[PDB]
Amino acid sequence: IIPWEERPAGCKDVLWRSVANPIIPRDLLPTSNSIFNSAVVPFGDGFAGVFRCDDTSRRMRLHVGFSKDAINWNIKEEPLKFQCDDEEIGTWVYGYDPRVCFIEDRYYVTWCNGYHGPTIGVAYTFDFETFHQLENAFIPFNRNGVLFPRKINGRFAMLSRPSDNGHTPFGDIFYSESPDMEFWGRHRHVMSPAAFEVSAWQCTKIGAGPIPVETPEGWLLIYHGVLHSCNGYVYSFGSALLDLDEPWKVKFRSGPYLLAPREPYECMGDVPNVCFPCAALHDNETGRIAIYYGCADTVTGLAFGYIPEIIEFTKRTSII
Amino acid sequence: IIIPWEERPAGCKDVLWRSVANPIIPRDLLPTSNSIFNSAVVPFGDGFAGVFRCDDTSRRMRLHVGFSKDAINWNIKEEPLKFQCDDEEIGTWVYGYDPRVCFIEDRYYVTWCNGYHGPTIGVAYTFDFETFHQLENAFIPFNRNGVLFPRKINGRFAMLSRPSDNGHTPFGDIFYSESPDMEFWGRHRHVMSPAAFEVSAWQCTKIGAGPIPVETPEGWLLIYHGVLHSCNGYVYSFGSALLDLDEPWKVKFRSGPYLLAPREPYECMGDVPNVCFPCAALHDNETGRIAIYYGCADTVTGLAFGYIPEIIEFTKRTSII
Amino acid sequence: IIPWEERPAGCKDVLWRSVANPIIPRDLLPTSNSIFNSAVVPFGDGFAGVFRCDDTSRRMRLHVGFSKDAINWNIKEEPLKFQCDDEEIGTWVYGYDPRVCFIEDRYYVTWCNGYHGPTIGVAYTFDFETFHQLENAFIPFNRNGVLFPRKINGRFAMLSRPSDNGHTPFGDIFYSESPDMEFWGRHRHVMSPAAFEVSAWQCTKIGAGPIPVETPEGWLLIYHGVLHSCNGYVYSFGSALLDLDEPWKVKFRSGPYLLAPREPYECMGDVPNVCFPCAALHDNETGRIAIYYGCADTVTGLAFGYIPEIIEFTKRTSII
Amino acid sequence: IIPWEERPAGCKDVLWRSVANPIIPRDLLPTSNSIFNSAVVPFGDGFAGVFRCDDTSRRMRLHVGFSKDAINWNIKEEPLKFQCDDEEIGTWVYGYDPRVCFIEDRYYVTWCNGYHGPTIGVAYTFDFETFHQLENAFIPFNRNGVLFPRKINGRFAMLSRPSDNGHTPFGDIFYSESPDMEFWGRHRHVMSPAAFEVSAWQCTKIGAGPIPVETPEGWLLIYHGVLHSCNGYVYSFGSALLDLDEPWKVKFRSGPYLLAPREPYECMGDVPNVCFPCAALHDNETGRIAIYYGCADTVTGLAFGYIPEIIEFTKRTSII
Amino acid sequence: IIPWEERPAGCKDVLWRSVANPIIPRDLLPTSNSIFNSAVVPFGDGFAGVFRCDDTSRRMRLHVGFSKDAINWNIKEEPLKFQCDDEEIGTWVYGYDPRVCFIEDRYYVTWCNGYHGPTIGVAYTFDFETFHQLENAFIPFNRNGVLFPRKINGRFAMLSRPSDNGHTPFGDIFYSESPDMEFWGRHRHVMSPAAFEVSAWQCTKIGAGPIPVETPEGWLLIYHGVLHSCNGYVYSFGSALLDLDEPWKVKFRSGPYLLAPREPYECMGDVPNVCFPCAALHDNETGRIAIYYGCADTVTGLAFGYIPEIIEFTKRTSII
Amino acid sequence: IIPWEERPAGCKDVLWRSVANPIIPRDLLPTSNSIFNSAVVPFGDGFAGVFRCDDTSRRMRLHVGFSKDAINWNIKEEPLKFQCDDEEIGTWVYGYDPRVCFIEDRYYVTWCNGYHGPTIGVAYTFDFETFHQLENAFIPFNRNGVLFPRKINGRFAMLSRPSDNGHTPFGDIFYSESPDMEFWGRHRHVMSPAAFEVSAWQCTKIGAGPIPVETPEGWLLIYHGVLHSCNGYVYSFGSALLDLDEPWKVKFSGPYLLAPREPYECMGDVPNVCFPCAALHDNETGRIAIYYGCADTVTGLAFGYIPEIIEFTKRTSII
Ligand SMILES: CC(=O)N[C@@H]1[C@@H](O)[C@H](O)[C@@H](CO)O[C@@H]1O
Ligand SMILES: CC(=O)N[C@@H]1[C@@H](O)[C@H](O)[C@@H](CO)O[C@@H]1O
Ligand SMILES: CC(=O)N[C@@H]1[C@@H](O)[C@H](O)[C@@H](CO)O[C@@H]1O
Ligand SMILES: OC[C@H]1O[C@@H](O)[C@@H](O)[C@@H](O)[C@@H]1O
Ligand SMILES: OC[C@H]1O[C@@H](O)[C@@H](O)[C@@H](O)[C@@H]1O
Ligand SMILES: OC[C@H]1O[C@@H](O)[C@@H](O)[C@@H](O)[C@@H]1O
Ligand SMILES: OC[C@H]1O[C@@H](O)[C@@H](O)[C@@H](O)[C@@H]1O
Ligand SMILES: OC[C@H]1O[C@@H](O)[C@@H](O)[C@@H](O)[C@@H]1O
Ligand SMILES: OC[C@H]1O[C@@H](O)[C@@H](O)[C@@H](O)[C@@H]1O
Ligand SMILES: [K+]
Ligand SMILES: [K+]
Ligand SMILES: [K+]
Ligand SMILES: [K+]
Ligand SMILES: [K+]
Ligand SMILES: [K+]
């Protein structure tokens, strides 16, 4: 039973904010400064996730959490620690912006893992208790690594985002495959930022968000876009549809955003003017989707929509 | 013409005071509007008309016509304004922002920051606020903050402008130019530069003209924006200068203090934090009342009020020239 | 009789904000734009101070103020003007971020003084009415000059912070001595910004805050640290303990911050996301300390704690 | 009777350097530091010009010169002064970038003239003794202003180059007209720098060089282009053909350069790696053209070719 | 038989330049602007290579050459074209930075290949006539890709250099493996730039040069390093020894450079002050090594030394 | 006897280059990459100096040298080490840009010394064998420290140049005093870069060069100036006259004295640099010989007459 709030009567938006936002407060843990990425999945009787909790030293750490309803979370006070047989890769430097999905027989976690700069760390868990670290998927610099929730043509597949070692002023989404969760390849460009005159919310850089959602018309990708104002970056988010069999081929891509920083909890915080989607839960029977997003890099919010309405919107307003 | 007005709050010593109804135009007035700021407002018939910068949910910059009985509650058209032009090259729309509007002699003219291989000053006219006829871009890129004078100056059209770059420009002097014909422009003269940081830091990074200049016996009243560069970005405040009537590039007085700076939450939080950007004014010479429209955090529009004579005293008393 | 508020019920924090914050509003003077540094000392039957009040021309001026209770302030409308025989040094360009303390027989004030760029101005007063300017202690560019409240083995001592002529993107704390409050030397590096992976609130630059506080164990130094986000700088503050006799030798240095921008008065204003400590009052009998800090470069706030608690926190969370 | 050297034996290039380069040395005047722009035209029985001569103070001044053979120049030691009835426009700050041509009944001079930054100064002369200064044609910031040598459908016409107030890191060529040499307008974009992968000698910025040369199929434009290497800008030059009636319409534009810094006098000097064409003499009856170019912002060189060969090259190698 | 010149009388240097430098001129081809990378190997009874020949449009293209003595080169006029099964990867944008070696049964080529930015293209050939292009090894941004000349414990191995999309101001060498020349992984950091105060010729960025040369004391890596002066980058090159079995482990790393820009052909040209090594030929029986390097990004030079002397220099001067 | 060459026939320049330039080659030492600062003084029956010799690791080191004629130098292969009882200040990180002068009873050496960034290191020697390091005079970031060759109203005095921790894009010359070679103060601004439209060779940044040369008409200061072209910095040098008694007061060049022209000034590790580092002079003949680094690679000499340089500085003054 995924979380849901009906669209307010007369609301014409494709996505609408939970009235309970923020659903995770910045100070939920004794040492937490902010909690703003929630890589959430169903698990047994309820829900589990991997959360970015930055502490009062401003260090970036991952913590495991569980919930009955996916709204109110019990997050472990102590950061998640990985088992790894390779001491070189198993060394912890930092970790942020997790994504989690089940593939075939286990849950896989990706995150932005420090290894001589940002790259994509990979691990798996069967139980959300023990996490086994695998090879970093790519050479630095790379972030926004997001796996597909099944193999594509017999290979594991991941979206990523080549970066630099700062506040990156550019960013294309890429796609890569692996036969074995160790060696990666067949890299393909998915999409670049839009032109400023066409769609400025996504004209500086873009990055994948929640795990792709399979639909009959393609993979639904929810992704962030940045606009560079005189005063900083603004992070909004929107939607595209990727080919099912060859997901680096984009079928439709929204001109308008789905959500942008409007509420005080989105506009004021450690990083003002940020809505950064990190996970989603959905139900194909009803078309409901619940999107988790970080707010001002301070707290976590939830927003709701219908998959068919999102698909319609994405087609109707497509810039390709 | 009955201009909008609120009396000075009891106890208030400031030369300008914000409307208690601010913001007077909300960000979601149109089905697809993301933000509405810059309101290029004038008296028109029974009421008021305007050209409004309404950025959409694709963050495209578009201009929309609006009308109002009271100049506070606006009815803005959902569909963007399109310009008529016989020249296909100049009539191609790329983007447009920060409109200014005034009547000159027989018609209303609109200038805006128009994209033509980068920012320049677009120019158009209308007789009825329904059909708009586009003329030559007045300048080569990069330029913006183009603001016309509301009558000819010794037989020529005149415009303030602001040479720029193709980014978030880290400089800006105000310039003055003339045209005999609304087509060719020239006799360019420097008006003013940003002040020294130690003299008046609200206006030390760059400056730009705001509302249409207001003719007084003491000179043209210029309301203009200024930028201060903090560690965390630009703060846009606005203040006042007085220009010579006959040669308006000659500045007579220029305020040290600002008239208004970002203070309220609707000025401080939004798409671009800490912006008060004046874009138009209505005034009544009989009473000296002036009402100044300004963009707030690049998100909504506000109003502020004051008296022309008090603004002139303030500009002279506090003048940094 | 230093101002005090007891720790809120259940509050686990080493420092807590006054419920009366902001304690000095931005519009206390007829042409003040902001009042956000308050260099406060006990004086006479009450308290005195030098205040940074930027005016509605956005000029940086210092003003004298007085208070019965250290919370409600009566600040002079006219800016403070220094007496100086030397015309060259006595020329006023600008002044900000004052610090004040009693040394031996008079009150000394330091400030960021414009002399072909930022340096550290120095003056004394016996009475908080007339101030007598001395030589600028250093060549530009320097700021965050903070004197020790006694001589250190027979020399005056000062912390400072080499800078540049902009929004400086670096900054180490230094220590210097003078026999005479005119000639300075024996410069020693105190500390550098921490590594991003270790303590990111203090990884861009750091600088001294309140006057150092003598404890049996060393000098308690309360200092600011900067984190560089994509949308600007975030100023937080924390604690270190310096050796009593050779104060450039750091004994402990906190990993977490004591305070970081959280409240709307800290997160919205002329410079968002700033907590900048500028003075403290303390009582060795009770262990109480009250810390004055600028908020968003707009208003002034107060936070409270206990010196022995701050000390034990600094030890236990030390990154050295 | 224009300066000429025959194509060297076995040279396959469309332009070839004079074997006597540089033809104007840096120290022709008693305080000249460099002489590297030579606006040159025929005049009387010989030749005249306006020369950029930077002095030993590194000031940028314009000097008149005269020559019998267009090779050996007698340059006036006193800088050129302009007559102007408007004292505002007539104030001299600096001047560089001259270009000179005859239009209908007199010579016109454009230069980069300081008026609150770079813009295009305009003046006329009948005799190279008195120059009457006209209004600056544009608002700053603009450089590389180059007049057409006749009216275009009854209007004066000028190419220009919007700039900034530094070492400008971009630059498109524009076209503008005037009915009266006072008011300017009908601004049209001519061309942008090419993409790096198409033609990198002209991918950073471009600007007009010598006065446009009329051919039966349009205007031959010789223009500089910049490549941004890790160690600086490299200035090369090449050729384009513009529509005769609407010269903003580009018909052909060379992929390859005509000339790039190769010789030591091009590679070493005040600004290394610079070939900047500033003027040309030509003879339609023979097809001969002699192109004057600055070398390393130090000295002046000459290069020779045939207009029909340049035209053929520009079409055959065109990137449009 | 590899090229050789004996060390000059009384030369104490570990490497010495050929008296015939530069061995390949900039204008060898009818449209060549510069020829400054030479990826050369033995082939049949003489030698072959892939050369970076930038043309007069300043486009970056690869051309095959052949030589009987590795000194006098006959380079094909037409750019090399790669055959590719996949149209998307097979699309040519640009290419530079070639390296060539034989591995097991064929020659492999790597190069800096444009695919939405710089990455490492891979191809093979049996005959230096037909080249078959494989998957790009990595996601952008990357270059200085250099294969090992045999498999390492049964996998192909490659050094690389994460980059950005400009004149990258950083750069560490990385190591990666592949079972199949398609999927890559087990990425390991090799080395970072040295500290400025330790070895400034390699303090900005580093990158691999010639193919690693197997010695009993490790893999001999010859690599470039950059020093950032006020006036640009200076490229020198030096040596390291890598563990034979785990070549990301660096055993010794030289303090001094082996070669730095000294000669006019290294210090003047399209990019001044560059010695950029691209290939080596060696003979284990005599210990002779001949290293090919680009000079000023304009021409190609050769330098000689003895492998045992280079090993001894590397260890004697090690900064590891 | 200071090194000297007569002004070439017909040469109208105030300074003229030695026909023997460069006088010190880049590879004088077994491991030298470049030798381009020569902080030279008369000593004994000859001359002595402290040389910036950057090595083949591109480390910046100081070496002592000696010469009979001040042209052909014998430089010690081993870098100079400084004696210091304070191990914190005595820690060597790097050192460049030395200047050397005699003050009253001994020789002093200043250099740009690494101490958490560039600052001005200070040391003395009685014999050019053992050097004793004193406190760094200033907090970082500071470079171009140049002592006066006598006390000024009973205090040591030094010119300096506030900088940053990179290739500094600005730079004013400052003046400071010390009663004791340990504690410094009375800091005064001497001059700023000129306006681009007035004198562009010195419009980005300036720094003091050789030790100030006393004359009856003021301290003759030879200093570098930078012009920022699209391709980098061009270092030229010129002259100013400072008040004798209060040397932060500038009394009087618009034109440069020397600017990069020769291949050895234009090509090398840092192209387009003439960086003056020391001068020898004889008041009785008016001769001065100025040592300058060329392209941060080698060392050159140029000659002039002090009266002519005074006359040039005054008649072309921009103040
Ligand atoms: C502690 C901190 O500021 N972390 C940020 C991270 O949140 C952000 O995504 C990244 C890109 O802007 O830069 C930094 O690593
Ligand atoms: C969509 C967007 O961000 N537009 C802005 C515009 O508002 C601003 O005035 C200009 C200068 O800072 O930059 C951009 O064009
Ligand atoms: C004195 C000097 O350096 N002048 C240059 C000028 O030559 C150059 O064309 C321009 C653009 O790079 O900038 C400067 O004005
Ligand atoms: O940098 C700001 C924003 O973008 C990414 O870079 C995130 O990890 C956070 O930083 C935030 O959502
Ligand atoms: O860029 C921020 C501010 O300045 C100008 O550039 C305006 O169009 C808005 O952008 C805002 O008022
Ligand atoms: O720069 C913004 C912030 O940091 C320092 O620079 C202070 O003087 C204030 O300006 C503020 O606390
Ligand atoms: O850019 C200059 C140098 O650096 C690299 O980036 C490549 O372009 C090299 O072949 C060249 O030697
Ligand atoms: O800036 C360097 C080059 O280009 C322009 O900018 C010219 O005026 C010269 O300065 C030179 O040809
Ligand atoms: O950096 C370039 C030039 O200026 C200073 O910075 C000197 O030490 C040398 O580096 C050179 O003379
Ligand atoms: K695609
Ligand atoms: K004016
Ligand atoms: K210390
Ligand atoms: K065109
Ligand atoms: K390693
Ligand atoms: K002075």
Short mmCIF file of N, CA and C and ligand atoms in Angstrom, two decimals, chain D residues 36 52 54 58-60 94 96-97 112 118 143-144 161 164-168 205 233 235 271 276 297, chain F residues 196 200-201 203 227-230, ligand 3:
data_model
loop_
_atom_site.label_atom_id
_atom_site.label_comp_id
_atom_site.label_asym_id
_atom_site.label_seq_id
_atom_site.Cartn_x
_atom_site.Cartn_y
_atom_site.Cartn_z
N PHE D 36 51.94 48.12 -35.47
CA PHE D 36 51.43 46.83 -35.89
C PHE D 36 50.03 46.85 -36.47
N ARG D 52 48.58 52.57 -35.88
CA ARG D 52 48.75 52.31 -34.46
C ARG D 52 50.21 52.16 -34.04
N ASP D 54 52.14 52.13 -30.56
CA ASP D 54 52.15 52.14 -29.13
C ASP D 54 53.52 52.62 -28.66
N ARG D 58 53.55 52.38 -23.22
CA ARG D 58 52.49 51.46 -23.60
C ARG D 58 51.13 52.11 -23.81
N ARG D 59 51.16 53.41 -24.15
CA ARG D 59 49.93 54.10 -24.60
C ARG D 59 49.68 53.77 -26.05
N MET D 60 48.42 53.80 -26.45
CA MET D 60 47.97 53.47 -27.79
C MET D 60 47.57 54.77 -28.47
N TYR D 94 42.13 57.02 -25.60
CA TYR D 94 43.04 56.17 -26.33
C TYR D 94 42.47 55.85 -27.66
N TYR D 96 43.05 52.77 -31.01
CA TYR D 96 43.79 51.66 -31.64
C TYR D 96 42.98 51.07 -32.84
N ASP D 97 43.32 49.93 -33.40
CA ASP D 97 42.43 49.35 -34.42
C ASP D 97 42.01 50.38 -35.63
N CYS D 112 39.18 51.99 -32.81
CA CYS D 112 38.65 51.68 -31.45
C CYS D 112 39.01 52.84 -30.56
N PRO D 118 35.74 50.75 -24.90
CA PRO D 118 35.93 50.73 -26.35
C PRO D 118 34.68 50.87 -27.14
N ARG D 143 34.42 46.97 -31.17
CA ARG D 143 35.78 47.10 -31.76
C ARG D 143 35.73 46.50 -33.17
N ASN D 144 36.82 46.55 -33.91
CA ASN D 144 36.88 45.97 -35.26
C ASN D 144 35.81 46.59 -36.21
N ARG D 161 31.93 44.66 -34.18
CA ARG D 161 32.18 43.50 -33.38
C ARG D 161 31.89 43.75 -31.90
N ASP D 164 33.49 43.25 -24.93
CA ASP D 164 33.37 43.62 -23.53
C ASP D 164 34.48 44.62 -23.20
N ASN D 165 34.77 44.84 -21.92
CA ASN D 165 35.84 45.80 -21.56
C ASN D 165 37.05 45.07 -21.04
N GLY D 166 37.29 43.88 -21.61
CA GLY D 166 38.52 43.14 -21.35
C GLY D 166 39.10 42.46 -22.57
N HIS D 167 39.84 41.34 -22.35
CA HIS D 167 40.29 40.49 -23.48
C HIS D 167 39.12 39.58 -23.85
N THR D 168 38.32 40.12 -24.71
CA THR D 168 36.99 39.59 -24.87
C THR D 168 36.98 38.11 -25.28
N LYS D 205 36.44 33.64 -31.22
CA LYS D 205 35.96 34.92 -31.69
C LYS D 205 36.53 35.24 -33.04
N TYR D 233 45.69 32.93 -26.74
CA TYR D 233 44.90 33.02 -27.98
C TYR D 233 45.90 32.94 -29.12
N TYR D 235 45.93 34.11 -33.06
CA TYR D 235 45.17 34.87 -34.05
C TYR D 235 45.65 34.50 -35.43
N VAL D 271 52.77 40.25 -27.93
CA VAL D 271 51.69 39.33 -27.79
C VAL D 271 52.04 38.18 -28.77
N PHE D 276 47.33 39.67 -37.50
CA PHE D 276 46.10 40.51 -37.44
C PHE D 276 46.04 41.45 -38.64
N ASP D 297 51.70 41.72 -32.29
CA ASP D 297 51.45 43.06 -31.76
C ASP D 297 52.76 43.82 -31.60
N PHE F 196 45.80 52.23 -16.96
CA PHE F 196 46.03 51.69 -18.30
C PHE F 196 46.25 52.80 -19.35
N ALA F 200 50.72 51.76 -19.31
CA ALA F 200 50.16 50.40 -19.27
C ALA F 200 51.21 49.34 -18.97
N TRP F 201 52.48 49.64 -19.12
CA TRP F 201 53.49 48.62 -18.72
C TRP F 201 53.46 48.31 -17.19
N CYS F 203 50.40 48.78 -15.25
CA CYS F 203 49.00 48.94 -14.88
C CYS F 203 48.32 47.77 -14.21
N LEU F 227 51.96 44.36 -17.48
CA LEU F 227 50.88 44.60 -18.39
C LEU F 227 50.25 43.22 -18.67
N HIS F 228 48.92 43.18 -18.60
CA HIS F 228 48.15 41.92 -18.80
C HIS F 228 47.61 41.90 -20.21
N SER F 229 48.24 41.12 -21.07
CA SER F 229 47.78 40.96 -22.44
C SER F 229 46.81 39.78 -22.49
N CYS F 230 46.22 39.54 -23.68
CA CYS F 230 45.33 38.39 -23.79
C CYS F 230 46.12 37.08 -23.58
C1 LIG G 3 47.90 48.11 -24.29
C2 LIG G 3 47.13 46.85 -24.54
O1 LIG G 3 47.44 45.87 -24.00
N1 LIG G 3 46.11 46.96 -25.39
C3 LIG G 3 45.15 45.89 -25.69
C4 LIG G 3 44.72 45.84 -27.15
O2 LIG G 3 45.87 45.78 -27.97
C5 LIG G 3 43.85 44.62 -27.41
O3 LIG G 3 43.40 44.62 -28.74
C6 LIG G 3 42.63 44.56 -26.48
C7 LIG G 3 41.87 43.23 -26.69
O4 LIG G 3 42.55 42.05 -26.32
O5 LIG G 3 42.97 44.82 -25.14
C8 LIG G 3 43.87 45.88 -24.84
O6 LIG G 3 43.20 47.11 -24.94
#
